[PDB]
Design a protein around this nucleic acid. Structure first.
Ligand code: K
Ligand code: K
Length: 871
DNA sequence: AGGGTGGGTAGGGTGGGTTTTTTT
C-alpha cells in the first residue's frame, strides 16, 4: 500500500484480509458427501414412480356458543335472587366499599348514558373504580328493570393476570364465587371459569374475542362489549376496536363502551363519530413529585467524577433540547444553589446514575417514615448493578431490610408468595423494571423512584430488524409510576430527569402497530373476510407505514401463503387456524406430517414466546451451566427445551417431590412448563381438527414414530422457518478459535449470551438457524441451532448448480454453496421437485401417511438420507 | 468488510465486549 491515508490503510488490508477470509470459507465449502449405494437405489425408483377448526380452538369459545334467548322467568329469578343477596353481611360490606369509590356517585350518568347510546368513552383517571364497577352497574341495572336475562356483557383486558384478577375482585364484590354458574367469570387461553349462560359478566383478553370472530363475525348473544385500558395501544385492542367500529352498522342492538384515562380519550371520542364521553375524577392520595434538581438539591449528591417515527422525532428533539439547555441552566441558578446545578450539567445521559438512586434509598430508609420503596430501572443490567451496590453496605446486610428484584426472567413465581421473612418495620425495597408498573402489584408502596429511561421495542421497516433501546420514559408511563403510590398513604415520587426533559416528553408511547411485524395481522385480516389487507389497515386508527405492509405482504408471498395477484390464501387457512406466528404454524405442520409431533410442539410452544427458564437474583452462571448441561451435545436451544421438557415429564411421572427438586435443580417454573404443555394440547387439537394427525394426543405413537431422532427433528426445525439462516465461520482468533456469524442481510452478527452456542467451538456442521433477531449493541440471535447441509438442502429454496475452479457446487438461495459431484446434485434437484409436488398435494388435502404402501410414501428415503451424514 | 506472522518510525472519532413485556 504505497498510498492511502491512515483510515484507508486499514481498508486496504481489510480488503485483502476479507479476500483471504472469504476465499478460505469458500475453500472449506462444507463437504456434503451423499455417496454410497444410496445413489444406486435412489436413482432407480426415481424413474419408476416418475413414469407411472377444532370448534373454536378446543372450545375456547364455549361461552360464545349461545344464542341469548331471554325469558321472563329467568328475569324474575335474577330480581328475587338480587333481593335475597341484598340480605347478606359480606354483600353489605362489599356494597359499602363500593360506595366508598368515586364511580358510585357516577352510577346514574354512566348507566343512563350507556343505555341511551351505542358508543361511550369513559376517561377513567386510574386509580378509580371504572373496571370493577361499570359492568356491575350495567348488569344490576338490567336485573333491576325486568330485562336482566337479555343482558350479556363481555370486557377485554390487555393482560391475562389483569383479566383473571379483575374477574376475581368483581366476583368477590358480589358475594359470589367466580364461575360455577355464578354472575362473573373469565375466559383465557386453555383456562376458563365461565359464568352463567344469561345475565353474566365475562372478562377475557382481546385474543379471545379475535378467536370468537372466526365463528361469529357479528358477535351474537353479546349485548354489551367493553374495551378497557385502551390508552395502552395494544395491537389486538386497536384491531378489535376498529373491527367493532365496522360492526356498529350491522348490529344496532349492540352497546360498545371504550375506556381510556383522561389524556387522549378525546381522540377515541373523535374516532367513533364524535361519540359522547364521561369523566370520572377517581381517587388517589396526594403524592409529591420531586425531579432531578430537587433530588440533588435535597440529598446533596456528589458524583464519583465520572426509519422510525419516534427515532426521527427524538433526534430533532435533542436538537431543540440543546437550544433549551443553556437558558434553562441560567434559570436554575436563580432557583437552586450553584453546586447542584453544576452537578446537573455534570450529569450524564444514556445511563441512569445508580449512585444517586442508592443515596436516595439510604436517605429515605434513614430519615423518612415507614413504607416500602419501588424502583423502576430500564433492564436487567441496572437491576443487577444496583443490587450489588446496595448489598455491598453493612446496613442492608441485616435481616431488617428486604430487597426484591423483579423481572420476567426473575423467578417471580416464588416472589409473589412471601411475607414469612420479617415483621413490619422492615424496608421492602423492590428493584424492578416496568413490570411492576404493568401488572404485578405488591401495593404496599409509599416511595417510588422512577428511573429516567426504559427499554422499548422499535421495529425497522427497511433493514427488517426488530430493535430495542432505552428511551426516555413516556409521560403516561411516568404518570402511572406516580400513581404507584397507591391507597396506602401519601407517597413520594422521584423522577431522575431534569425539568427540561419533562417539557420534551412524548405524551404517549407509540402504538404496537408501528413497532412489530404484521404477518399474523395480515393473515387474520385475510381470514376474517375483511377484504383488502392494506385497506383495512388504512381504516385502522393510526395506519402503519406503507413499506411495512408491502414487506409483510411480500413475506407472506414468499411462504406461498398469499397469492401473488391479490390476498388469496392457498395454505393461509391452516396457518391462520393456528394462533401462533406463521413460521411456527409451518413448523408444526412439517412436524405433524413427519411423525415427530411432541418435540415440534414443545419447540413451537417455546418459540411462540414464553421460554421456560428462570434466573434468580445474581447467580446466573449456574443457570447457564444447567442449561448448557441440558443441551448436552445437540448445540441447539430448541433441542435443549425438548430435553428439559422430557426430563420434566419423567420427573413428573416419578413423583411430586422429584418434580420440585427438578425445577429447583435446573431453574424451571412449573407454571410456564404447564402452560406450554397445554399449548401443545391446543396445537394438537387444531392439527386433529385439520386432519394431520389421528388423535388428540401429542404423544400418540401414530404421530410419533420418528419422534426420538435428532436429525429429523432438526430437519423439521429448518423446514419450519425456511429463511433466517446464519453462516458459522471458523477463525484463528487469538491463536485459538472463536465465533463469527453472518446472515447475508444485516452483515456481521453475533450470538446472544442467553443461548447455548455462545462460546461453543466444536460444531459438526457450519450452518445455524434462528428465529429472533434483535438490534442492541450488535445484531444478536436469541435462539439458534445447527443444521445439517442435507437438512437445509430439502427446505431452503431455489437450487443452483454452478462450479468454478472446484468440484460441482450446490447453492440454495444463491449465497449458501457447497461442493459435491454434479451427477448427484441434479438428482437431488429432481428429487426436490418431486418432494415439492408431494408436499403441496399433501398440503391441500392432508391425511396420515399410512406407512408403508410405498405408492405415495417416498419420504423414508429422505429420512434415511438425513440419517446418514458426516462432519 | 478484518487481522496481529500489515505495523504501531498511520492512528483510535475507523472498528473490533450482555438478558423487555407481553397473548392467540
Ligand atoms: K488495529
Ligand atoms: K487497522
Amino acid at each position: 500500500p504505497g498510498h492511502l491515508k491512515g483510515r484507508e490503510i486499514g481498508l486496504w488490508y481489510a480488503k485483502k484480509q476479507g479476500q483471504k477470509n472469504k476465499e478460505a470459507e469458500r475453500q472449506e465449502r462444507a463437504v456434503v458427501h451423499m455417496d454410497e449405494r444410496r445413489e444406486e437405489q435412489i436413482v432407480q425408483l426415481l424413474h419408476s414412480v416418475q413414469t407411472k377448526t377444532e370448534a373454536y380452538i378446543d372450545r375456547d369459545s364455549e361461552y360464545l356458543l349461545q344464542e341469548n334467548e331471554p325469558d321472563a322467568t329467568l328475569d324474575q329469578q335474577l330480581l328475587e335472587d338480587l333481593q335475597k343477596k341484598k340480605t347478606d353481611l359480606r354483600y353489605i360490606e362489599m356494597q359499602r366499599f363500593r360506595e366508598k369509590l368515586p364511580s358510585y356517585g357516577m352510577q346514574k350518568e354512566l348507566v343512563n348514558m350507556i343505555d341511551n347510546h351505542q358508543v361511550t368513552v369513559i376517561s377513567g383517571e386510574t386509580g378509580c373504580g371504572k373496571t370493577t364497577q361499570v359492568t356491575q352497574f350495567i348488569l344490576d341495572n338490567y336485573i333491576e328493570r325486568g330485562k336482566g336475562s337479555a343482558c350479556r356483557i363481555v370486557c377485554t383486558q390487555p393482560r391475562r393476570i389483569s383479566a383473571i384478577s379483575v374477574a376475581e375482585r368483581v366476583a368477590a364484590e358480589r358475594a359470589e364465587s367466580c364461575g360455577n354458574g355464578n354472575s362473573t367469570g373469565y375466559q383465557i387461553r386453555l383456562q376458563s371459569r365461565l359464568p352463567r349462560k344469561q345475565g353474566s359478566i365475562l372478562y377475557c383478553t382481546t385474543g379471545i374475542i379475535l378467536q370468537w370472530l372466526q365463528s361469529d363475525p357479528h358477535l351474537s348473544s353479546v349485548s354489551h362489549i367493553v374495551l378497557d385500558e385502551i390508552h395502552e395501544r395494544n395491537l389486538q385492542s386497536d384491531v378489535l376496536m376498529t373491527v367493532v367500529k365496522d360492526l356498529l352498522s350491522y348490529r344496532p342492538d349492540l352497546k360498545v363502551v371504550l375506556m381510556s384515562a383522561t389524556l387522549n380519550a378525546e381522540k377515541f371520542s373523535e374516532y367513533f363519530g364524535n361519540c359522547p364521553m364521561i369523566h370520572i375524577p377517581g381517587f388517589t392520595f396526594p403524592v409529591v413529585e420531586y425531579l432531578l434538581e430537587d433530588i440533588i438539591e435535597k440529598i446533596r449528591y456528589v458524583p464519583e467524577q465520572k426509519g422510525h417515527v419516534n427515532r426521527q422525532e427524538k433526534y430533532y428533539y435533542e436538537a431543540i433540547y440543546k437550544e433549551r439547555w443553556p437558558g434553562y441552566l441560567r434559570e436554575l441558578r436563580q432557583r437552586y444553589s450553584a453546586s447542584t446545578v453544576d452537578v446537573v450539567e455534570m450529569m450524564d445521559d444514556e445511563k441512569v446514575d445508580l449512585n444517586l438512586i442508592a443515596a436516595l434509598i439510604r436517605y429515605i430508609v434513614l430519615e423518612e417514615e415507614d413504607g416500602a420503596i419501588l424502583v423502576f430501572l430500564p433492564g436487567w443490567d441496572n437491576i443487577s448493578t444496583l443490587h450489588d451496590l446496595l448489598m455491598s453496605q453493612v446496613m442492608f446486610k441485616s435481616d431488617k431490610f428486604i430487597i426484591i428484584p423483579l423481572h420476567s426472567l426473575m423467578p417471580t413465581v416464588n416472589q409473589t408468595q412471601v411475607f414469612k421473612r420479617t415483621p413490619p418495620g422492615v424496608r421492602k425495597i423492590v428493584i424492578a423494571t416496568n413490570i411492576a408498573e404493568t401488572s404485578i402489584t405488591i401495593d404496599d408502596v409509599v416511595y417510588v423512584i422512577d428511573g429516567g429511561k426504559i427499554k422499548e421495542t422499535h421495529f425497522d421497516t427497511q433493514n427488517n430488524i426488530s430493535t430495542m433501546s432505552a428511551e426516555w420514559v413516556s409521560k403516561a408511563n411516568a404518570k402511572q409510576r406516580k400513581g404507584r403510590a397507591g391507597r396506602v398513604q401519601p407517597g413520594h415520587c422521584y423522577h431522575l430527569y431534569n425539568s427540561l426533559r419533562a417539557s420534551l416528553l412524548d405524551d404517549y408511547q407509540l402504538p404496537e402497530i408501528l413497532r412489530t411485524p404484521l404477518e399474523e395481522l395480515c393473515l387474520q385480516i385475510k381470514i376474517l373476510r375483511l377484504g383488502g389487507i392494506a385497506h383495512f389497515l388504512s381504516r385502522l386508527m393510526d395506519p402503519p407505514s406503507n413499506e411495512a405492509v408491502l414487506l409483510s405482504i411480500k413475506h407472506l408471498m414468499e411462504l406461498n401463503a398469499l397469492d401473488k395477484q391479490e390476498e388469496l390464501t392457498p395454505l393461509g387457512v391452516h396457518l391462520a387456524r393456528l394462533p401462533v406466528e406463521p413460521h411456527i404454524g409451518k413448523m408444526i405442520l412439517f412436524g405433524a406430517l413427519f411423525c415427530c409431533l411432541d418435540p415440534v410442539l414443545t419447540i413451537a410452544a417455546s418459540l411462540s414466546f414464553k421460554d421456560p427458564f428462570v434466573i434468580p437474583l445474581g447467580k446466573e452462571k449456574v443457570a447457564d451451566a444447567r442449561r448448557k448441561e441440558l443441551a448436552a451435545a445437540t448445540a441447539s436451544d430448541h433441542l435443549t427445551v425438548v430435553n428439559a421438557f422430557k426430563g420434566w415429564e419423567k420427573a413428573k411421572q416419578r413423583g411430586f417431590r422429584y418434580e420440585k427438586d427438578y425445577c429447583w435443580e435446573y431453574f424451571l417454573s412449573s407454571n410456564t412448563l404447564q402452560m406450554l404443555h397445554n399449548m401443545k394440547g391446543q396445537f394438537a387439537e387444531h392439527l386433529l381438527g385439520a386432519g394431520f394427525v389421528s388423535s388428540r394426543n401429542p404423544q400418540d405413537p401414530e404421530s410419533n414414530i420418528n419422534s426420538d431422532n435428532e436429525k429429523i427433528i432438526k430437519a423439521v426445525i429448518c423446514a419450519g422457518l425456511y429463511p433466517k439462516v446464519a453462516k458459522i465461520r471458523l477463525n484463528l482468533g487469538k491463536k485459538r478459535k472463536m465465533v463469527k456469524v453472518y446472515t447475508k442481510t444485516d452483515g456481521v452478527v453475533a450470538i446472544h449470551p442467553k443461548s447455548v452456542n455462545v462460546e461453543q467451538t466444536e460444531f459438526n456442521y457450519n450452518w445455524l438457524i434462528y428465529h429472533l433477531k434483535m438490534r442492541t449493541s450488535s445484531i444478536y440471535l436469541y435462539d439458534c441451532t445447527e443444521v445439517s447441509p442435507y437438512c437445509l438442502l430439502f427446505f431452503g429454496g431455489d437450487i443452483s448448480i454452478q462450479k468454478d475452479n472446484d468440484q460441482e457446487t450446490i447453492a440454495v438461495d444463491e449465497w449458501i454453496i457447497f461442493q459435491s459431484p454434479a451427477r448427484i446434485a441434479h438428482l437431488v434437484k429432481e428429487l426436490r421437485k418431486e418432494l415439492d409436488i408431494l408436499l403441496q398435494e399433501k398440503i391441500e388435502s392432508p391425511h396420515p401417511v399410512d406407512w408403508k404402501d410405498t405408492k405415495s410414501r417416498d419420504c423414508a428415503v429422505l429420512s434415511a438420507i438425513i440419517d446418514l451424514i458426516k462432519t
